[PDB]
Amino acid sequence: ELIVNVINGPNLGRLARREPAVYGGTTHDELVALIEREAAELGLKAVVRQSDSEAQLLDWIHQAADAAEPVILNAGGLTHTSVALRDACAELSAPLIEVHISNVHAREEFRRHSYLSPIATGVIVGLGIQGYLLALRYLAEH
Amino acid sequence: ELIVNVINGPNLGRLARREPAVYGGTTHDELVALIEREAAELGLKAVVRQSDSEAQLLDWIHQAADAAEPVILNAGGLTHTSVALRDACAELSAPLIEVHISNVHAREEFRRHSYLSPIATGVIVGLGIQGYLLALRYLAEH
Amino acid sequence: ELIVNVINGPNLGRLARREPAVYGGTTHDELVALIEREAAELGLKAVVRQSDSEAQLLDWIHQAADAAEPVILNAGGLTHTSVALRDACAELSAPLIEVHISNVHAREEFRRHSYLSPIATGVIVGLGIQGYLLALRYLAEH
Amino acid sequence: ELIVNVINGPNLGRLARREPAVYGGTTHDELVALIEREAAELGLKAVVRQSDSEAQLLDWIHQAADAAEPVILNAGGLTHTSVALRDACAELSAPLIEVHISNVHAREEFRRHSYLSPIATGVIVGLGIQGYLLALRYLAEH
Amino acid sequence: ELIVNVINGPNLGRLARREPAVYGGTTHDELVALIEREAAELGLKAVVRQSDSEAQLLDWIHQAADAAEPVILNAGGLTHTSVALRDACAELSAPLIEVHISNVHAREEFRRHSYLSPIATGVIVGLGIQGYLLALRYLAEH
Amino acid sequence: ELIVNVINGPNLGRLARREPAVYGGTTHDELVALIEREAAELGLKAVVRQSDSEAQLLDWIHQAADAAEPVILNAGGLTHTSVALRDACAELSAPLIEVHISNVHAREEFRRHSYLSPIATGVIVGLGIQGYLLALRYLAEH
Amino acid sequence: ELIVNVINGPNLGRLARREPAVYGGTTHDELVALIEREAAELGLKAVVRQSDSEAQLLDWIHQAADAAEPVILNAGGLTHTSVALRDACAELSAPLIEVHISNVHAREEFRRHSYLSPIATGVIVGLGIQGYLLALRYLAEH
Amino acid sequence: ELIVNVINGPNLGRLARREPAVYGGTTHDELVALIEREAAELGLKAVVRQSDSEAQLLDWIHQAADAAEPVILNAGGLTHTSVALRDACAELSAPLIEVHISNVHAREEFRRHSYLSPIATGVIVGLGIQGYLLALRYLAEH
Amino acid sequence: ELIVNVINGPNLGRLARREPAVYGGTTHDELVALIEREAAELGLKAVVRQSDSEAQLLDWIHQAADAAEPVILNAGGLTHTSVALRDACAELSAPLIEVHISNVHAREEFRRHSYLSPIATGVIVGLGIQGYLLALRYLAEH
Amino acid sequence: ELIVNVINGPNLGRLARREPAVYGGTTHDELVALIEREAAELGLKAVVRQSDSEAQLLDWIHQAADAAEPVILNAGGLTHTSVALRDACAELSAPLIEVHISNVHAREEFRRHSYLSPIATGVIVGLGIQGYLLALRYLAEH
Amino acid sequence: ELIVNVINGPNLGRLARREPAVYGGTTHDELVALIEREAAELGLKAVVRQSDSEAQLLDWIHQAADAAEPVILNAGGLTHTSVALRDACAELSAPLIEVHISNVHAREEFRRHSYLSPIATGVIVGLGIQGYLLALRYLAEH
Amino acid sequence: ELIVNVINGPNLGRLARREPAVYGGTTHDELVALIEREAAELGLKAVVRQSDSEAQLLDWIHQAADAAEPVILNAGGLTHTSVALRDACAELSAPLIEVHISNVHAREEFRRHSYLSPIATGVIVGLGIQGYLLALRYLAEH
Ligand SMILES: O=C(O)c1cc(O)c(O)c(Oc2cccc([N+](=O)[O-])c2)c1
Ligand SMILES: O=C(O)c1cc(O)c(O)c(Oc2cccc([N+](=O)[O-])c2)c1
Ligand SMILES: O=C(O)c1cc(O)c(O)c(Oc2cccc([N+](=O)[O-])c2)c1
Ligand SMILES: O=C(O)c1cc(O)c(O)c(Oc2cccc([N+](=O)[O-])c2)c1
Ligand SMILES: O=C(O)c1cc(O)c(O)c(Oc2cccc([N+](=O)[O-])c2)c1
Ligand SMILES: O=C(O)c1cc(O)c(O)c(Oc2cccc([N+](=O)[O-])c2)c1
Ligand SMILES: O=C(O)c1cc(O)c(O)c(Oc2cccc([N+](=O)[O-])c2)c1
Ligand SMILES: O=C(O)c1cc(O)c(O)c(Oc2cccc([N+](=O)[O-])c2)c1
Ligand SMILES: O=C(O)c1cc(O)c(O)c(Oc2cccc([N+](=O)[O-])c2)c1
Ligand SMILES: O=C(O)c1cc(O)c(O)c(Oc2cccc([N+](=O)[O-])c2)c1
Ligand SMILES: O=C(O)c1cc(O)c(O)c(Oc2cccc([N+](=O)[O-])c2)c1
Ligand SMILES: O=C(O)c1cc(O)c(O)c(Oc2cccc([N+](=O)[O-])c2)c1
Ligand SMILES: [Cl-]
Ligand SMILES: [Cl-]
Ligand SMILES: [Cl-]
Ligand SMILES: [Cl-]
Ligand SMILES: [Cl-]
Ligand SMILES: [Cl-]
């Protein structure tokens, strides 16, 4: 606060228009609108970005580390697979909240391990799109 | 909503007055006050209970299943150990949110498995006492 | 024989009125009636008890060990989790039959390990409420 | 009911005359007599067969699937080892009960995994020869 | 080529008339017709055999090793369980293709290990009955 | 059919000119020619693409999901490592066939696990370059 | 010192009168006498309690944490199973000694893992009833 | 002694004429001649049989158990896979020696586990055809 | 020699200016200067590149394979995670040395497995920035 | 009693003068003095030896087995690694107590397995130098 | 042949006079006599040595490698634990036979892994003292 | 610097004259010459010792700890097996570099775990004899 970095990884540009049983009927742009409006009332700025590239995501983390600005991260598949991501996050001085739209713990046994959690401030899973909004509100207090 | 069952398990009566490095400087009673005030503004009732007994906790879940009222659960150690708890929760018709005050994923490798998660709606870990408050607010929307 | 201890653990007071896809449409009291009537014709006494408390169950086992009277045990979740139970049973001089209402082997991989089996006389799973009745009838022969 | 297929696998022709510490002093033929007499009073027909051949056993299962007649199976060693058996059973429309004469759970750790259980109706272990008789009686109710 | 050995293991005589959700509505004989007709146009002979016996299958492999003729193998359950089979195949001078009608990788975790694959030329799973036909056509090129 | 998406992942631009013990003496362009000619006679269009980038591959899958057009995927190393890929594929409405040029099961034990298989229609491994051609022909039937 | 909390868990009220091959011919009350007399000569007070309830034990630990008084713990089965216990102990400011009457390491492989050890001062196993007495004497020095 | 049962399992009829890198250039019949001649000088009878059928092998073991005559067993693949075999052997009153022609411990990691060893008198691996002859000579002493 | 490819992966552009407890106070550019000066005296050319992109790194390896020029690789997180990298390296005709700035073996247990090592010439870990310089000097001899 | 063999393994000659955070400020010779004085009052003889050689230690055990005299063993690293030691101890007719100066269970996960425990009378860990003294006193009773 | 190195490891000097349930009533010297007499008739020299020291054993292997003379090895505990031994043996040009007096496979699960087997010619276990004699006789043929 | 302890473990006296495929054609003495000459130019003293005894090696480490002089360690097999070594090294105040002549990571899966690495400064594997020389040069800088 004021500035709050919201980051989505691979596939998360496909929200709503594809799925929506599993990650909900809300499109990406609509999500940016949701976050931006909730940051308004909270008196925060939400810089909300999405990418299907690990190097892009990496860069955004690098920048957040530098600017010492907090992050909210939905890294998609890279959550379970990337050590490069984890280690970039590890550097962040500001809090990092890990967010999952679906409950990870009620799926394939592999989706239950996370490289991000151990170095996150805390995690939200399965509360859907609202996970982002609840994460925001946390940061506005701390 | 209106009625929201908030449940803490073993040891969680010792909040603040003991620790507070790990689970924070906020006492139990103060937590009940926090929750009760946040439920006020939200237009919910928070029935917040704590017990060091598995049979007691079981009973409270039974009642919540019956009344079809939502639960927020910080089951302490029973999270990693009790199948009896998990299965009582499994019955709940209303949403169940699993809450951890400390980040479970940044501790002993054993604290990372949960019998509750797979059948929870979703989970919050490491956001501290606020985890309860963010959980509440979820339920008020859904 | 004559005296046969029938014991149910956690959650098993909720039979029929809750579930009944998984553990059947038969309530607890109705089960006591079923057992008591089958013991009648067999010329046995069925002392059938249920508790959601490990210390209670423990006590009933202690008493059965002392009285050297047989046990039929549906320990619910404690089957997979409690070493305290297992060891109390281990003491029983009389036969112990382990009973599961649902087939344990057709569920979560964790439900397939039992602390009770290795020291039971034998086990019945998935034959539903009748498991108790078939267990009884065994004891009446041996 | 009326027709109930009782099947024993490898080595089970050696009952009583060999062992009898572990699987009891009752010979195979005597077991057929026991089952046939219990089916009499129950008003069932017991077609009780034994083979040391997987292809033979397979064939008998095939036939039972076809005739939609229930099975009681003591598959000996093939219980822990054969996927071919499991899958033939999987096809059966009628209930299948898995029977073990000795308690499997009180022996070598390997004897504790079963390919049959997950797709059985239910299982009986360690109740000795009576396991067959209790299984029968189940089927006569359902 | 010309001569191509097509071999099915346990249960695979039950094709179509039983299942057909999982392994398809095509009967065994119809499959022989399918293969024989595809070998016609390809200018190959298809010797297509099925057995529920490991010793029979073994013998057919022995003969194929001797005649140095290629094999297409759907060994059913023996795929995951038999080292005797694997080792007989290992001897084959000609290519061996492993065929599965259902996708093995989308089922029980145990169905995912194969004793045959490591010493096969290659494998086809989940393409249904056509797996055989595509395997044939391979052999006609190499 | 008509339109069939053929996709190769990392390193697969190096075909023939490098290796060729392991993945064969056929160059990439020659492979496109092979596929394009086989699609000709089949009356299909083969859109055959290769990339060493996960985001690129992701995008091509996204497009195929959208256009509801089938995919043939040789994802190279990402087969064993990427959950992001798997999940993009999971979305595809049309069949997906997983193709490996080398037999994966006859190499390092790690090359034997696949994130793609469980959600593929079926898989071809070790039939070399022809795997693509046999996959095509499948799709032309279904 | 002066005040030394001695705590036994589940089943440990059955000492001597039941067993005594495994945990010895000495009854509970006799053990209290033994400890109380050894504390006499040492110039300590031994407050020796036993319970079959986890909540009771929990409470006694809570009190010991508060009073900053040392503990000697024979938690029976809860040693291998309870994280709730472990964490209550973790809080104790004073030394905690873990005591086992039987050698845990010469039994079932499961009895060899302890949730208590990692946060104990030290452990005594297999020295029988004397383990308590040797533990006492330690505390009297430190 | 006098009578010594020598048994080979699956594939072992193919000795010499096929392989011979791995299990040696000596044919089966030649092996029978070797054994029969060594039993001559030793003053034993060697009844040497081979089968590719588990039921056949089973039967021969049954007979040996009955006649209380010793066995030398090269069970091929069934060594690593069959519990039915192991248990038939378990019954033998006379010594059983397990024989492997190739060193099992210098091959695939799976070939290193044996169901037979734990209940054998002792084992010989990798000494080639002579393993049989050395086994014989043992029995002639004991 | 003369030409030596030095490659850094993800995050390694952040050297010195960020960290420096763990990977040292030396910036990337300063590292290029260090390497370039050491190659001077050695009579080698150091082409030192860094990228946060797997496809970029892949390309540089491809080129090195082609030019048959040696590589020194600090692949960051991709060391533990990428099979695509490993396999591109596998192709290199020239020696590859794997370099880690921090000791990998004194950190998280996951950082201890490497996809690169098995196909490297050799590895240097924990000797800090000098690892690169010692690697260079190796290549100048061989 | 009278004669009590006290044995230390590798590195344990370095006590006090090196460490002393972990195994305490007490030197070896001082430990011999401590033990010798405690054996005085107890009316025992303490023959206390230390060696960094497995063959030496072996020999001392051999002698103790022969003389049927009890042992107290701090085998250092050989505790977790040597089967030769374990088996020499296994022979001892007299009690063996296993002693660890540091709590083994609060360190590296590998330090938690012991080859000695299963065949010890009992074990003391983490009670520091006093572990030896408490062990002595045990032996003086039994 | 002529010269055959027979080597025993740790504890094996204690044969007969200690045990003899497990490794037999035959003393070491008597074993040397047995071997020396059997080598006589065979026309071999048996150089039979025993040591409780790894460096000694190492040296004897070194010498055997040098002299290219065969070895028979009973390495006691070092069989399951030493890589140093294994690797010294690995060097031997002549055959190495691994000998165990007791059946290793019928004991603790840990005694079943051997560092020696994979690089032995072959192994004998459980044939008692005669294992040595049968090993000798092998070498005299090859 | 000046004084640098170079230590080789078991079998490493056999360098060059035996092997040399795997650890190179350079004899031990020649290695001492190599190291001594490289230390000359560096202005260091190399005290280079080798032993096949764990107690000897232990002693040399003890001395190095005492003298606070750096170590370079090629511990041969003890690398994967000895906790006694690891712990002696752990004490060293000066840097310790772990050196392997062969690439450990390209061999048996067991050779890939090291007790030494976690407490080393850093490690060199597979750079052959030069590993020692590069290690030296490191120490001369730090
Ligand atoms: O936020 C999550 O809970 C989540 C977790 C995962 O493991 C994903 O791969 C993941 O990413 C996907 C994967 C496939 C499709 C979509 N999508 O169509 O929004 C998103 C999201
Ligand atoms: O909410 C959590 O994050 C939490 C997680 C756990 O695994 C606990 O055992 C746990 O319970 C404890 C354990 C020990 C002490 C206290 N306390 O003094 O508040 C609470 C809490
Ligand atoms: O008898 C069984 O097969 C059984 C097995 C289990 O693992 C249970 O947790 C178990 O207990 C439950 C759990 C949840 C709900 C009920 N119930 O509503 O009867 C019973 C029963
Ligand atoms: O019914 C059982 O409990 C049972 C379980 C098993 O794992 C058997 O192998 C098994 O089969 C055997 C094995 C060896 C001997 C006999 N028999 O002499 O009856 C039967 C039976
Ligand atoms: O070809 C396969 O994909 C396949 C794989 C398996 O694991 C089988 O057990 C298997 O065999 C069965 C098993 C049960 C029933 C039938 N069938 O009724 O055709 C076939 C087939
Ligand atoms: O299609 C396969 O069977 C395959 C499987 C893999 O695991 C690959 O990494 C893989 O990709 C590579 C890896 C290295 C080199 C090449 N190439 O020079 O064609 C291709 C291909
Ligand atoms: O102190 C021990 O060594 C001990 C260890 C355990 O794992 C117990 O379950 C345990 O508790 C029991 C269990 C069953 C019976 C009795 N008892 O009759 O004293 C005590 C005691
Ligand atoms: O005696 C052995 O060492 C042995 C061990 C095995 O694991 C076999 O499968 C085995 O059986 C085979 C397998 C394939 C071929 C032959 N054969 O051509 O003699 C024999 C033999
Ligand atoms: O060279 C290494 O020892 C090393 C090993 C790793 O596992 C890395 O992730 C790794 O990459 C990182 C990760 C996070 C931050 C930095 N950095 O600020 O230089 C570099 C480097
Ligand atoms: O008694 C123990 O608790 C103990 C346990 C261990 O695992 C040791 O390696 C061990 O040995 C060491 C190891 C390193 C240094 C010393 N020392 O300087 O006394 C002693 C001692
Ligand atoms: O030859 C064997 O079968 C054998 C196997 C082992 O694992 C031993 O530790 C072993 O060594 C011992 C161990 C303890 C005692 C004796 N002994 O009194 O002859 C010998 C021997
Ligand atoms: O430095 C190494 O890379 C190395 C690694 C190991 O695991 C050894 O056992 C090892 O020791 C041996 C083993 C067998 C033979 C020799 N040698 O003839 O030099 C040396 C050396
Ligand atoms: Cl979580
Ligand atoms: Cl069961
Ligand atoms: Cl596959
Ligand atoms: Cl312990
Ligand atoms: Cl063996
Ligand atoms: Cl390394």
Short mmCIF file of C-alpha atoms in Angstrom, two decimals, chain L residues 22 26 31 35 42 49 56 70 111 123-124 134:
data_model
loop_
_atom_site.label_atom_id
_atom_site.label_comp_id
_atom_site.label_asym_id
_atom_site.label_seq_id
_atom_site.Cartn_x
_atom_site.Cartn_y
_atom_site.Cartn_z
CA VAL L 22 37.51 -44.31 -14.63
CA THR L 26 47.89 -40.72 -13.04
CA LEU L 31 49.58 -36.71 -7.92
CA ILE L 35 49.88 -30.88 -6.08
CA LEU L 42 50.88 -20.57 -5.51
CA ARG L 49 48.15 -37.83 2.70
CA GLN L 56 43.66 -42.71 10.31
CA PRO L 70 42.07 -26.11 5.37
CA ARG L 111 26.98 -42.70 -5.50
CA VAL L 123 32.46 -29.57 -4.11
CA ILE L 124 34.27 -30.55 -7.34
CA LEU L 134 41.48 -26.19 -8.87
#
